[PDB]
Design a binder for this molecule. Sequence first.
Ligand code: CA
Ligand code: CA
Ligand code: CA
Ligand code: CA
Ligand code: CA
Ligand code: CA
Ligand code: CA
Ligand code: CA
Lengths: 393, 393
Amino acid sequence: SSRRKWNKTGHAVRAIGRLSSLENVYIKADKQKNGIKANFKIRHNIEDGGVQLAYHYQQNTPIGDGPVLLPDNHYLSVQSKLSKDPNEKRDHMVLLEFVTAAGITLSKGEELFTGVVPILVELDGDVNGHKFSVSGEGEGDATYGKLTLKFICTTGKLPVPWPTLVTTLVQCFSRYPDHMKQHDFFKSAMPEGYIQERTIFFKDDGNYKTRAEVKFEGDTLVNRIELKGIDFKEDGNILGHKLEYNTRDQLTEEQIAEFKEAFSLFDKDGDGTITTKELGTVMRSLGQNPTEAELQDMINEVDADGDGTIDFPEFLTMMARKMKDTDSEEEIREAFRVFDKDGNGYISAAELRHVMTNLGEKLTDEEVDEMIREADIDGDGQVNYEEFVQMMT
Amino acid sequence: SSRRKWNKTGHAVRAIGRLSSLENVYIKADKQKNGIKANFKIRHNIEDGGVQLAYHYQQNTPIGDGPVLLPDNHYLSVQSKLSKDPNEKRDHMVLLEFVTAAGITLSKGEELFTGVVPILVELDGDVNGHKFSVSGEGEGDATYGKLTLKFICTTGKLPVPWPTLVTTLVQCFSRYPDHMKQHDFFKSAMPEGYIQERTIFFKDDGNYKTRAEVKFEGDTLVNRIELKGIDFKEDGNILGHKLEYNTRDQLTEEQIAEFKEAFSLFDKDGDGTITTKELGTVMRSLGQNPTEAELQDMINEVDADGDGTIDFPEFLTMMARKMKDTDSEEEIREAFRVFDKDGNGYISAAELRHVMTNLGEKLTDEEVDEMIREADIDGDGQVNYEEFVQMMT
Ligand SMILES: [Ca+2]
Ligand SMILES: [Ca+2]
Ligand SMILES: [Ca+2]
Ligand SMILES: [Ca+2]
Ligand SMILES: [Ca+2]
Ligand SMILES: [Ca+2]
Ligand SMILES: [Ca+2]
Ligand SMILES: [Ca+2]
């Protein structure tokens, strides 16, 4: 039938789009410049529909003369979230970002990034003759590939949309997994730093050319940029400000922080990933004793890059999974039974603290009492299943 | 805060459940019996909530004396869909199943399964003294790991729920990828066949013990089973028929068949998986010429078992992906532009046939006309964007 022919041809053509839709940042060595090159495309959603493509071409070279690491081909996977500060009057962007290297299967610089690192960003721009500046500050935690920053336009109104400046405004904060440590050029160039140059082509519109110096100044990682844009159309998507600010929707900063706290309970050594030993330790603490092979099978069923561990973005994907309403409810039932160790249908204060302390939290009885009090609708001093449901909902 | 503590502890406990939730069928060699062993658990949804667990223990041994293949540890991934025949008065089950081997990273028997194979299934059962029989027939297409069968209770009312009999009622039809051909015990035992024995333990209830002979009789693959159940509770979930029949919901047989037809357009050699060469061929046919490395990157971003190809269940996952309403609409825009080769905003009959013939279909002009006619709301002889949207929606 014609409708069947349409449907199947449609699927095929849509499949081409999904199969060919490279969203990752692809990195290759540039041995002749003792550095790297990258290319990728950014899809900027246009207000009221459509996308504005931005083709990125990138090259990086060391500032110092110390030896650096030149990588085999690989990529970075980026999850970004843009938001606003309700208390901020200046034109601004709040940014949360997780970035993880992958694509390859199973020293001084690395040490600089094991903890939380303060970040300063400064950009002076010229787009079609319009002069502007941006300042940003925040922190980087390369262990989880995490960035949190706030940027301000210090010259008033930004003459271009914030999302077009995201890639320009610190890939040294990417998480490189253990088996890819020898492929992290960005950290290897530290503390002296690297130069990062891009041309960014906005299709049917102008282009940005950027040059940046990324280096430590004392204990702060600093990104200092010059940007120049040319050939932009007065009422194009850029100068005409026709791009969406943030994506609809997104699991929000607060929820992510909750999942991260949960993640830390498993990631006992704080190295940014969960191993079989760590999952085993957690399960053993709650009374379950699966074998090493079983733990490996368990991790495999939710391991996306086959590295044998669950990193934070993998943890997030597992927990953000859709779930049928029936599965969701049964999962909550199973969770209740975990808390309710004696199976009497009520979570006591003693059972709550046993669970949390075993997971690796350090609560006083008074803190446990307050959690109980929060959920204890009928005031009997315990949390029944119905009360537990509300609390988890 | 207490709510934050609850939320994060909740996530952690729920994460344990999702991390530990082995759903795959785990296969290991049983060299002493010249065969294999397996174990897995099935979660049967209980009507009005809850799950009935069924712990499976399995062993298989060859019927013949010819040499067989003993595998390294691996697993089978199963997607099953139960349905009913509205025209069927007998107690019955309609079943569609895709089964794919994995878990291992990068002869006479195999040949028997390269095409569609007819299947007959017969089971004589005794559960708590209740005698019953089931007959089934259908086809297997191991190339896609696909089974399609219909089963009838030939003794009247089935004294147990259909879903509890699914695993008992032909793993020779699993798709084993090229790099795992030496690990396919099931096909290696053919045509002479194998004995398959299980004990299935239903938690807080009775157990099934099964013995089956799976072998070719002429050109038909036959599964002949004896089942005995003991210790079942009169008003347990089994004898009391308290289990859900099918899962809510599921992309339906008709949609899957459309996606399979779409898949075949890429899978030009019909070997059940899409390579970089095949995606390249398809894209080249529509005017796109990505490099081999680009095609490999493209496939990687949607490759789940890292084997470097996209099999049918991987294709389905890619196409069943959630998609934000805005992404969905832009994807349809991009698809339109593919059909509308001259960019005039209208898909002509000439443009439609060019697209379909290049994808690898063989339509007459009259068939193309009918597709146009189906979508051509305003009768101008072409398909505009609004008309295209309706057709894809
Ligand atoms: Ca760890
Ligand atoms: Ca992983
Ligand atoms: Ca209790
Ligand atoms: Ca209570
Ligand atoms: Ca193929
Ligand atoms: Ca694959
Ligand atoms: Ca046209
Ligand atoms: Ca028309």
